[PDB]
Amino acid sequence: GFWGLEVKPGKPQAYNPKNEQGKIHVTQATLGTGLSKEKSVIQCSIGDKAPIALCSLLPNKIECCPLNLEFDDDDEPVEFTVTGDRSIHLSGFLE
Amino acid sequence: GFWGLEVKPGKPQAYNPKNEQGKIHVTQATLGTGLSKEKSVIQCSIGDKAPIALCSLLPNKIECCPLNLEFDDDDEPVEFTVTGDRSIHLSGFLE
Amino acid sequence: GFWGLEVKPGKPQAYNPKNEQGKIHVTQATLGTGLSKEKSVIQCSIGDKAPIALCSLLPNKIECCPLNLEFDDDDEPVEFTVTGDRSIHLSGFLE
Amino acid sequence: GFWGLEVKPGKPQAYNPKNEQGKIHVTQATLGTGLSKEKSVIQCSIGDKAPIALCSLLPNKIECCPLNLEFDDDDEPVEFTVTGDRSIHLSGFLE
Amino acid sequence: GFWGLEVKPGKPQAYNPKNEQGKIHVTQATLGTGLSKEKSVIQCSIGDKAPIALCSLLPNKIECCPLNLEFDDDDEPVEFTVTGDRSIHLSGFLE
């Protein structure tokens, strides 16, 4: 089952893994539409832990990058932060 | 079993996962023949949900990119949209 | 068990998956030795179907690229076509 | 379950796999914030063995790279060394 | 269990998979330290078969590349050849 999520830039965006039925496999991060040349980073913060940079995407150089991440119900607060002004599309599959 | 699909640009193209016997693993997106330098994106729309950018391919820079996507019979309407004028070949395997 | 195959350019080259004992996992395509700068593409044609571009390799920029392809005995005619004049080494493992 | 670790540069940093409940899958190395252009390498030393370079990251060119590494309780001393002055965020999942 | 091997350049280097307890997963090839700009290739020769190029690494452009290779006890003679003067670190995990 295909899975997708657009994580908007600016204000950091929360995400709830329990919304989906099964485990989320984040296998790709794709840069959204935009005009800024600045490097874009998506950071994942679990609970009160410090954010961990999932990947770095370079506009016009590397606009997509493979990922291998698994999100389940165990980490109750999942909070995605995106640097820059371009959205980052996370794609993958369920279970 | 090898699987392949050429998703044409321009008018967005529907796809029916039930045509194949088993689950489709989309493990690669390869840029088709063409002369345009513009960045090419393939977007996947499931049902009425907003399209999610699967990957971004740069002509003459990144003409192929690994993917890890699984398509099955559960998502009845699967609709592939390709930006640009170059076709995008999706390759992988069944089951 | 390691698996490898050099697919020569020019005249398109047939391949028989039944030669090996188990399923072939094509996990990498590496550009062979050569002097041409042109982009090299390996296309896979199964039966009478149209060729599907497996990957695109750029000399001096991207001379290798990860793949995730599975070839078994079910597809009787497997026919590899390579664009350019550089051979493409397919590497992986069996079963 | 998401896993993350920031490996600081400079003095080499020890890591204890037994802290986590399950096996650690290091599936990505992402360059941390910084201004240096020099290439950054994270080296893994197990026991008394010589360090093995896990990956090389180029600032402003390749700031993230996929990995497939599994760390468990069997290797008691695990010692991460990072070259350069930029931290390297290791991300993945447990078990 | 982490696995690592430094394959030296120059004279081609033999390797014995039976030294390790379990199957070797070669999931990454990282360029070693060096000053040469020439492209570096690691070739795998099994038995009397012709060498198959595992991957091609470009200094200062692509110093690491993901791999998916499995080496076991079945291929008795495994012989790694590295082009160039830079060593290539193979990293992965056992079993």
Side-chain angles (χ1 to χ4, degrees):
Chain A
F2 172 76
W3 176 93
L5 167 64
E6 189 168 0
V7 184
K8 323 294 262 153
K11 151 196 64 213
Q13 158 181 337
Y15 165 83
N16 210 330
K18 274 134 289 203
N19 297 341
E20 303 75 330
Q21 192 268 357
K23 169 182 334 193
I24 299 70
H25 284 254
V26 182
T27 71
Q28 195 90 193
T30 318
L31 224 39
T33 192
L35 300 174
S36 80
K37 296 329 165 284
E38 35 89 28
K39 141 206 172 203
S40 308
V41 184
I42 169 168
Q43 279 170 345
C44 169
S45 326
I46 299 284
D48 78 299
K49 309 206 199 123
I52 293 293
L54 298 188
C55 77
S56 188
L57 283 181
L58 261 306
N60 316 117
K61 288 174 172 143
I62 316 201
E63 307 236 347
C64 68
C65 60
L67 303 169
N68 199 13
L69 296 174
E70 307 185 358
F71 288 101
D72 42 82
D73 305 348
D74 291 26
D75 36 19
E76 200 280 302
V78 183
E79 152 95 26
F80 286 127
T81 325
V82 162
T83 317
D85 50 347
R86 288 141 153 284
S87 43
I88 285 170
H89 300 68
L90 306 185
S91 59
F93 50 93
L94 284 214
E95 266 175 310
Chain B
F2 172 76
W3 176 93
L5 167 64
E6 189 168 0
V7 184
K8 323 294 262 153
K11 151 196 64 213
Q13 158 181 337
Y15 165 83
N16 210 330
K18 274 134 289 203
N19 297 341
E20 303 75 330
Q21 192 268 357
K23 169 182 334 193
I24 299 70
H25 284 254
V26 182
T27 71
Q28 195 90 193
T30 318
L31 224 39
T33 192
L35 300 174
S36 80
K37 296 329 165 284
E38 35 89 28
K39 141 206 172 203
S40 308
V41 184
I42 169 168
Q43 279 170 345
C44 169
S45 326
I46 299 283
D48 78 299
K49 309 206 199 123
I52 293 293
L54 298 188
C55 77
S56 188
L57 283 181
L58 261 306
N60 316 117
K61 288 174 172 143
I62 316 201
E63 307 236 347
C64 68
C65 61
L67 303 169
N68 199 13
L69 296 174
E70 307 185 358
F71 288 101
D72 42 82
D73 305 347
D74 291 26
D75 36 19
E76 200 280 302
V78 183
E79 152 95 26
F80 286 127
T81 325
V82 162
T83 318
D85 50 347
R86 289 141 153 284
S87 43
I88 285 170
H89 300 68
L90 306 185
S91 59
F93 50 93
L94 284 214
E95 266 175 310
Chain C
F2 173 76
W3 176 93
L5 167 64
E6 189 168 0
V7 184
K8 323 294 262 153
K11 151 196 64 213
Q13 158 181 337
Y15 165 83
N16 210 330
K18 274 134 289 203
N19 297 341
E20 303 75 330
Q21 192 268 357
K23 169 182 334 193
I24 299 70
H25 284 254
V26 182
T27 71
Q28 195 90 193
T30 318
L31 224 39
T33 192
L35 300 174
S36 80
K37 296 329 165 284
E38 35 89 28
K39 141 206 172 203
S40 308
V41 184
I42 169 168
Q43 279 170 345
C44 169
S45 326
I46 299 283
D48 78 299
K49 309 206 199 123
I52 293 293
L54 298 188
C55 77
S56 188
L57 283 181
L58 261 306
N60 316 117
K61 288 174 172 143
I62 316 201
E63 307 235 347
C64 68
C65 60
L67 303 169
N68 199 13
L69 296 174
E70 307 185 358
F71 288 101
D72 42 82
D73 305 348
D74 291 26
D75 36 19
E76 200 280 302
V78 183
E79 152 95 26
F80 286 127
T81 325
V82 162
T83 318
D85 50 347
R86 288 141 153 284
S87 43
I88 285 170
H89 300 68
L90 306 186
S91 59
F93 50 93
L94 284 214
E95 267 175 310
Chain D
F2 173 76
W3 176 93
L5 167 64
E6 189 168 0
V7 184
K8 323 294 262 153
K11 151 196 64 213
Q13 158 181 337
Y15 165 83
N16 210 330
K18 274 134 289 203
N19 297 341
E20 303 75 330
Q21 193 268 357
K23 169 182 334 193
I24 298 70
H25 284 254
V26 182
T27 71
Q28 195 90 193
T30 318
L31 224 39
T33 192
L35 300 174
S36 80
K37 296 329 165 284
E38 35 89 28
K39 141 206 172 203
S40 308
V41 184
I42 169 168
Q43 279 170 345
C44 169
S45 326
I46 299 284
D48 78 299
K49 309 206 199 123
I52 293 293
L54 298 188
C55 77
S56 188
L57 283 181
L58 261 306
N60 316 117
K61 288 174 172 143
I62 316 201
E63 307 236 347
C64 68
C65 61
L67 303 169
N68 199 13
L69 296 175
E70 307 185 358
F71 288 101
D72 42 82
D73 305 348
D74 291 26
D75 36 19
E76 200 280 302
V78 183
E79 152 95 26
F80 286 127
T81 325
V82 162
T83 317
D85 50 347
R86 289 141 153 284
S87 43
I88 285 170
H89 300 68
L90 306 185
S91 59
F93 50 93
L94 284 214
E95 267 175 310
Chain E
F2 173 76
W3 176 93
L5 167 64
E6 189 168 0
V7 184
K8 323 294 262 153
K11 151 196 64 213
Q13 158 181 337
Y15 165 83
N16 210 330
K18 274 134 289 203
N19 297 341
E20 303 75 330
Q21 192 268 357
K23 169 182 334 193
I24 299 70
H25 284 254
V26 182
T27 71
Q28 195 90 193
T30 318
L31 224 39
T33 192
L35 300 174
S36 80
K37 296 329 165 284
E38 35 89 29
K39 141 206 172 203
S40 308
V41 184
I42 169 168
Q43 279 170 345
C44 169
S45 326
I46 299 284
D48 78 299
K49 309 206 199 123
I52 293 293
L54 298 188
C55 77
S56 188
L57 283 181
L58 261 306
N60 316 117
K61 288 174 172 143
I62 316 201
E63 307 236 347
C64 68
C65 61
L67 303 169
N68 199 13
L69 296 174
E70 307 185 358
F71 288 101
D72 42 82
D73 305 347
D74 291 26
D75 37 19
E76 200 280 302
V78 183
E79 152 95 26
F80 286 127
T81 325
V82 162
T83 317
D85 50 347
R86 289 141 153 284
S87 43
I88 285 170
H89 300 68
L90 306 185
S91 59
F93 50 93
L94 284 214
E95 267 175 310

